[PDB]
């Protein structure tokens, strides 16, 4: 388990940490969401290439197919929250507190 595995695993942790610390931006939040996807794609690519799991080389592709699909969903949701509330800071949508 060489150091490149450490780099991208520790990377995904900061993607997890980055997502879980929304400061003032939904768009920057979605950035960290797609950020997670890099490390998962990159680690998955390293795994099935190292192990010569040739039939499983499709798995990183199918990750990406369902990757941007969420990415489109996030921005489409971001379209209306910014459209009808003006901005994208995740603090002005607290009307559901009650």
């Amino acid at each position: 388990m060489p150091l490149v595995y450490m780099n991208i695993i520790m990377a995904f942790a900061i993607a997890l940490a980055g997502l879980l610390m929304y400061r003032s931006h939904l768009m920057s939040s979605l950035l960290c969401l797609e950020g997670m996807m890099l490390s998962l794609f990159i680690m998955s690519t390293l795994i099935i290439l190292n192990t010569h799991f040739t039939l499983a080389n499709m798995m990183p592709i199918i990750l990406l197919v369902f990757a941007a699909c969420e990415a489109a969903l996030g921005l489409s949701l971001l379209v209306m929250v910014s459209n009808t509330y003006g901005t994208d800071y995740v603090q002005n949508l607290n009307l559901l507190q009650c």
């Binding site: 699909c69 969903l73 009808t84 949508l93």
Partner: protein, 347 residues
């Protein structure tokens, strides 16, 4: 939303959940979750109220985070095992990552502050679909991987759910909010028995599905969303709220109503596993769930509440909608205790 697109949108949700319960490959299980999330977000914001947008939004970030963590926990399992099959997880960190990864989809432990107001903002129709159908998929994954589960973590997940769910419901008026905390309370009950006997949580799931279904489409018929709005239904529809008493009592587990069958049968199983202190605990803290059930029962028809003069022509008109299996759902949700040994059909 046009009717035809709505149907295909629903079918995608059912297909997404069905993909989870039939696939043997971890990637496909993740895909089934992804399709389930993708087809559901439009369903929540069907009416396009301002509330539904962030209600659907809070759904998205929570479950996307859960899906991404689930994908990561899958990847480590592949790294240390080279397997995609749903048998068990050969890295303890991989398992200890999926429990919360699946928990936020279920909404059990403090990964639950999304459940109340996502139920509140969205309509009653999708609220029913959210709290009943969206739990078969994550629970099905848990049932398959039930072998390699850290009992200390999984039990704490459920114990926290019962305490918070019961405690939170005591301070809710909006009927959807109380249902969410009540659902969270039942979340712990099903998941507490998960490590010991997976047949039991299936039984509790089936009973809870009937409880939440029958309760909700009674709320749909009553066309009420807050406790005060429900109160007036005694003036118009006395039988609906009178039936709502028995379902509320059953939902609280007050026997011999059908709602006792999970709470009873579960307790019997864990005492077989020398677990005694914890079963006594949820027996105690199921009572706070019962509290706001009776308060709902008191406010609905156990005590007739002040009405509104605008109800005359309301009595002049009957419902045109046609809830089906409602007469059936009440029967299973109230009186199936004599057929308790039927749990062996699941086994």
């Amino acid at each position: 939303m046009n009717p035809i697109i709505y149907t295909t949108l629903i079918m995608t949700v059912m297909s997404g959940t069905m993909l989870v319960m039939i696939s043997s490959h971890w990637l496909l299980i993740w895909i089934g979750f992804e399709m389930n999330l993708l087809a559901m977000i439009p369903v929540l914001m069907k009416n396009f109220n301002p509330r539904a947008t962030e209600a659907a939004t809070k759904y998205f970030l929570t479950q996307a985070t859960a899906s991404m963590m689930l994908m990561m926990a899958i990847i480590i399992n592949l790294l240390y095992s080279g397997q995609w099959t749903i048998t068990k997880m050969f890295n303890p960190v991989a398992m200890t990552m999926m429990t919360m990864a699946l928990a936020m989809k279920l909404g059990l432990s403090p990964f639950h502050f999304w459940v109340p107001e996502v139920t509140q903002g969205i309509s009653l129709q999708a609220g029913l679909l959210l709290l009943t159908w969206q739990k078969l998929a994550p629970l099905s994954v848990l049932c398959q991987i039930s072998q390699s589960i850290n009992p200390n973590l999984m039990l704490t997940m459920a114990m926290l759910s019962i305490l918070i769910g019961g405690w939170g419901g005591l301070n809710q008026t909006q009927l959807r909010k109380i249902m969410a905390y009540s659902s969270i309370a039942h979340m712990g009950w099903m998941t507490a028995v998960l490590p010991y006997n997976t047949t039991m949580t299936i039984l509790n799931l089936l009973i809870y599905i009937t409880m939440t279904l029958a309760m909700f489409m009674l709320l749909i018929h009553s066309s009420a969303t807050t406790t005060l709005s429900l109160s007036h239904t005694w003036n118009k529809m006395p039988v609906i709220t009178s039936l709502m008493m028995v379902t509320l009592l059953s939902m609280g587990g007050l026997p011999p109503l059908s709602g006792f069958m999970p709470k009873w049968m579960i307790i019997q199983e864990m005492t077989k596993n020398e677990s005694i202190i914890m079963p006594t605990l949820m027996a105690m803290t199921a009572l706070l769930n019962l509290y706001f059930y009776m308060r709902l029962a008191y406010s609905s028809s156990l005590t007739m509440f002040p009405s509104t003069n605008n109800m005359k022509m309301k009595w002049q008109f009957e419902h045109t909608k046609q809830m089906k299996l409602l007469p059936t759902m009440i029967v299973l949700s109230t009186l199936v205790l004599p057929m308790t040994p039927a749990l062996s059909s699941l086994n």
